[PDB]
Copies of this chain bind each other. A is one copy, B any other.
Amino acid sequence: DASTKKLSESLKRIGDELNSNMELQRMIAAVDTDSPREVFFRVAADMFSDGNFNWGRVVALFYFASKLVLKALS
The interface of chain A, by Cβ under 8 A from chain B, is 3-25, 27-28, 30-31, 39, 42-43, 46-47, 50, 52, 54-64, 66-67, 70
B57–A11 touching, CB < 8 Å: yes
Are B27 and A10 in contact, CB atoms less than 8 angstroms apart? yes
Q: What secondary structure prevails in chain A residues at the interface with B?
A: helix
> Copies per complex?
2
Q: Is there an interface contact between B55 and A67, defined as CB atoms closer than 8 Å?
A: yes
Partner of A7, one of B9, B15, B31: B31
A54 lies within 8 A of B19 (CB): yes
Q: In the assembled complex, how far is the CB of residue A46 from the closest CB belonging to chain B, in whole angstroms?
A: 4
Given the known interface contacts A27-B3, A55-B66, A59-B63, the answer about A46 and B15 at a Cβ–Cβ threshold of 8 Å is: no
